[PDB]
Paper text:
Mcl-1 (myeloid cell leukaemia 1) is a member of the Bcl-2 (B-cell lymphoma 2) family of pro-survival proteins that regulate programmed cell death via apoptosis. Mcl-1 is an anti-apoptotic member of the Bcl-2 family which binds to pro-apoptotic proteins containing the BH3 domain, a short α-helical stretch of around 16 residues. Binding of Mcl-1 to the pro-apoptotic proteins prevents apoptosis. Here, we report the characterization of an antibody fragment produced in vitro against Mcl-1 which was formatted as an scFv and a Fab.
Standard molecular-biology techniques were used to add mouse constant domains to the scFv VH and VL domains, yielding a Fab. The heavy and light chains were co-expressed using a CHO cell line and purified. After cleaving the light-chain C-terminal His6 tag, the Fab was crystallized with Mcl-1 by mixing stoichiometric ratios and screening for crystallization conditions. Crystals from the same crystallization drop were cooled after cryoprotection using 23% butane-2,3-diol and sent for data collection at the Diamond Light Source (DLS) synchrotron. The crystal structure showed that the crystals belonged to the same space group as the scFv complex, with similar unit-cell parameters apart from an increase in c from 75.4 to 106.2 Å. Comparison of the scFv and Fab complexes showed no significant differences in the positions of the VH and VL domains (with an r.m.s.d. on Cα atoms of 0.41 Å). However, Mcl-1 bound to the Fab complex showed a more complete chain trace, which included the Mcl-1 residues Ser196–Ala204 that were not seen in the structure of the scFv complex. These elements appear to be stabilized by crystal-packing inter­actions in the Fab complex crystal. Finally, an electrostatic interaction was observed between Glu250-L of the Fab and His224 of Mcl-1. In the case of the Mcl-1–Fab system it was not necessary to cleave the light-chain C-terminal tag in order to obtain crystals. In fact, cleavage of the tag caused a significant loss of protein owing to precipitation, so the tag was left in place thereafter.
Residue numbers in the entry:
A (entry chain A): 166 to 324
B (entry chain L): 2 to 202, 205 to 216
C (entry chain H): 1 to 134, 139 to 192, 197 to 218
C-alpha cells in the first residue's frame, strides 16, 4: 500500500519515539528543532520523559525478562521482536498506559543496544515501535487527539 | 438534540427519581456519558463522569448508569436543593462532535400536581387590518412547570412561525406560559381549523377554534 | 483558585462579527483541551467547539461550521471564539469549559458571556384585543405586539383589577418582543388594559368588549 511517511501522524510519532529512544541510550538531549510536531512534539517529549522513566522502573522485572526470552544481541533479533510486539499489543483494549509501556520497553531495548555497541540499530528499533503503534492503532490515536491527547491524559499539576 | 431526555421528571422529598438519556451506537454505544446539573441563572456543574463517577462535592445520592445506547441518572432520596435542570452528554464518533441531551427539569413536588388551564384567542379585526393574524394560547396553573405545545392548522402540524414562552412561576407557586402562531391575513383566510395542544405530565389538554365566529 | 472568565459579549447585528475571549487562571492552561458551549434563552446546552492543548485538533458543531473559528494563546492563558455571519439563532450565553484529560468531562466552566444578535430599533407596541369568539366567568386580554426593547407594563382599569389577572412573560417574534396579559372577570361593566412602553415613551389604553 502507501508509504508510512505519507501519513503526518506516522511521521510525527516516528520523530517523538526516535528522539525519546536516542536520548535514553545516549544520556544527552537533542537541541536541534523538531521537523514535524513542533510545540506539540516538544510537549509530548516532556510528558514521555516524566511518565516513561516511571514505567521503566515499575515494569523493570517484566522488561528484563522479556529481553531474555528474545535474547537481543544483533540486527536480526530486532526483526523477530516486531512480530512479538504486534501480536501482544493488538490483543484486547488499547489505552495510553499500554502505549507508554511499549515506548518504555523500546527505551529499555535501546539502552541495552548502547552497552552491546549496536547504536546503529536504535533508529530501526524506533521505526519498529512506531510501525507497531501507528499501523495497528491509527483510528484510536486520531479519536484520542494523538500526541495532544497523550499530554492531556497524563497531565497532573504541581505541587 | 441527538440525545433524547424527558423534559420533566418529579417526586416528593425522599422519593427515588430516574432520568433517562437515549442515544445511539455512535455516541452512548461507543463512549462514556457525563451528567451536568444546572441551577437557574447559573453555569452548568459536572455531576457524573465516566457513566457513574461522582466528582468531589457531589452527594452520594446521585448515581449514574449506562447500558447499550442508553444512560440513566438516579436521585435516591429527593431533597429540595435537587430542583434543577439535568443534561447528559456523550462524544459522537460519526459527528466528531459532543452531543448534549435536551435536558430534564427535575421538580421536587411541594404541592399536588395541577393540569394546565388552556385558553385560545383568535386574531383581532384591528390586527387583521395590518394583514397579519396572531393566535394567542394562554396556559395557566400547571405544576410541574414544564409544557410542550403543538399547534395544528386543519389537523396538520405546525413547525415554523410559532413561539412559545418559557414557563413562569405564578403567585400560588404553579406555572404560566403563553404560545403564539403568527400568520398573514391571507393564510388565516384560507384555513378553517386552529388548535393549541398542551402536553403536561403525558396527558394532552386541547383548545380549538374555527375562523367563522 | 481554578477559574475561567469569559468576555466580549454584547449586541451585534445579523451578518456581523464578534470575538469572544476566555481568561484562564490557577492552572496549566497548555495541558488541557478547551470547549465553547452555548445556551439560548430558556433552551438547552449546545456544544459549539473544542481545541486540543497544542491546537492540533479542532472540532465544530454543524450549526457553526464555516462561520466560527476557535483558537488559543497558551503564552497568554487565553481561549478565543471568532464568530462571523451571525444570525438570531446564535443569541445565547457562551460558556468556556475545561476538559479533563483522562475522562473528557467538563469540570471547570466560566460564568458565561451573553451574545445578542439584534438589528432592531426602538419600536412602540401595537395593542390588540384578546376576546373569545363563538354565561358565568369570561377571560379577556391584551396582545402587546412588536415592541423593542424590554420591558412593558400592563394594568387593568388603571389598577382596580388585579385579581384574576395573568401577565405572561415576553417572547421574541422576528427581532421584536410580544407579550400578552389576560384577566378573568364575571360575565355581564367596563374592562380596559393600560399598556406603557417607557423606552418609546408610549401610553396606550384599550377597551376590551366582545
Amino acid at each position: 500500500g502507501p508509504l508510512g511517511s505519507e501519513d503526518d501522524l506516522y511521521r510525527q510519532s516516528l520523530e517523538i519515539i526516535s528522539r525519546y529512544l536516542r536520548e535514553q541510550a545516549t544520556g544527552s538531549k537533542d537541541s536541534k528543532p523538531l521537523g514535524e510536531a513542533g510545540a506539540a512534539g516538544r510537549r509530548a517529549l516532556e510528558t514521555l520523559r516524566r511518565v516513561g522513566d516511571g514505567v521503566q522502573r515499575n515494569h523493570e522485572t517484566a522488561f528484563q525478562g522479556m529481553l531474555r526470552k528474545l535474547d537481543i544481541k544483533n540486527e536480526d533479533d530486532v526483526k523477530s521482536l516486531s512480530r512479538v510486539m504486534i501480536h501482544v499489543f493488538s490483543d484486547g483494549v488499547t489505552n495510553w498506559g499500554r502505549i507508554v509501556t511499549l515506548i518504555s520497553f523500546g527505551a529499555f531495548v535501546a539502552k541495552h543496544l548502547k552497552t552491546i555497541n549496536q547504536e546503529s540499530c536504535i533508529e530501526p528499533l524506533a521505526e519498529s515501535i512506531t510501525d507497531v503503534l501507528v499501523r495497528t492503532k491509527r483510528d484510536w490515536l486520531v479519536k484520542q487527539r494523538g500526541w495532544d491527547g497523550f499530554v492531556e491524559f497524563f497531565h497532573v499539576e504541581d505541587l | 438534540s441527538v440525545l433524547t431526555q424527558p423534559p420533566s421528571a418529579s417526586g416528593t422529598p425522599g422519593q427515588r427519581v430516574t432520568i433517562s438519556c437515549s442515544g445511539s451506537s455512535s455516541n452512548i454505544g461507543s463512549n462514556t456519558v457525563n451528567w451536568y446539573q444546572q441551577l437557574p441563572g447559573t453555569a452548568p456543574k459536572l455531576l457524573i463522569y465516566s457513566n457513574n463517577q461522582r466528582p468531589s462535592g457531589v452527594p452520594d445520592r446521585f448515581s449514574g448508569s449506562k447500558s447499550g445506547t442508553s444512560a440513566s441518572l438516579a436521585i435516591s432520596g429527593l431533597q429540595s436543593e435537587d430542583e434543577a435542570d439535568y443534561y447528559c452528554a456523550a462524544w459522537d464518533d460519526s459527528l466528531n462532535a459532543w452531543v448534549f441531551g435536551g435536558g430534564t427539569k427535575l421538580t421536587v413536588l411541594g404541592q399536588p400536581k395541577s393540569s394546565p388551564s388552556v385558553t385560545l384567542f383568535p386574531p383581532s379585526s384591528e390586527e387583521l387590518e395590518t394583514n397579519k393574524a396572531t393566535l394567542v394560547c394562554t396556559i395557566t396553573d400547571f405544576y410541574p412547570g414544564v409544557v410542550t405545545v403543538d399547534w395544528k392548522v386543519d389537523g396538520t402540524p405546525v413547525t415554523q412561525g410559532m413561539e412559545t414562552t418559557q414557563p413562569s412561576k405564578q403567585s400560588n407557586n404553579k406555572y404560566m406560559a403563553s404560545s403564539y402562531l403568527t400568520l398573514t391575513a391571507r393564510a388565516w383566510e384560507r384555513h378553517s381549523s386552529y388548535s393549541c395542544q398542551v402536553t403536561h405530565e403525558g396527558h394532552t389538554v386541547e383548545k380549538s377554534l374555527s375562523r367563522a365566529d | 483558585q481554578v477559574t475561567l472568565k469569559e468576555s466580549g459579549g454584547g449586541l451585534v447585528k445579523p451578518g456581523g462579527s464578534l470575538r469572544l475571549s476566555c481568561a484562564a487562571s490557577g492552572f496549566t492552561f497548555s495541558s488541557y483541551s478547551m470547549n465553547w458551549v452555548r445556551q439560548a434563552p430558556g433552551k438547552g446546552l449546545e456544544w459549539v467547539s473544542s481545541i486540543s492543548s497544542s491546537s492540533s485538533y479542532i472540532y465544530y458543531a454543524d450549526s457553526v461550521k464555516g462561520r466560527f473559528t476557535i483558537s488559543r494563546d497558551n503564552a497568554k492563558n487565553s481561549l478565543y471564539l471568532q464568530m462571523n455571519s451571525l444570525r438570531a439563532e446564535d443569541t445565547a450565553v457562551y460558556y468556556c469549559a475545561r476538559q479533563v484529560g483522562a475522562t473528557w468531562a467538563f469540570d471547570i466552566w466560566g460564568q458565561g458571556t451573553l451574545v445578542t444578535v439584534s438589528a432592531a430599533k426602538t419600536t412602540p407596541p401595537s395593542v390588540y384585543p384578546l376576546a373569545p369568539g363563538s354565561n358565568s366567568m369570561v377571560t379577556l386580554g391584551c396582545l402587546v405586539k412588536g415592541y423593542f426593547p424590554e420591558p412593558v407594563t400592563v394594568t387593568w382599569n388603571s389598577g382596580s383589577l388585579s385579581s384574576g389577572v395573568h401577565t405572561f412573560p415576553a417572547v421574541l417574534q422576528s427581532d421584536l418582543y410580544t407579550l400578552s396579559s389576560s384577566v378573568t372577570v364575571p360575565s355581564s361593566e367596563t374592562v380596559t388594559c393600560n399598556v406603557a412602553h417607557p423606552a418609546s415613551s408610549t401610553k396606550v389604553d384599550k377597551k376590551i368588549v366582545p
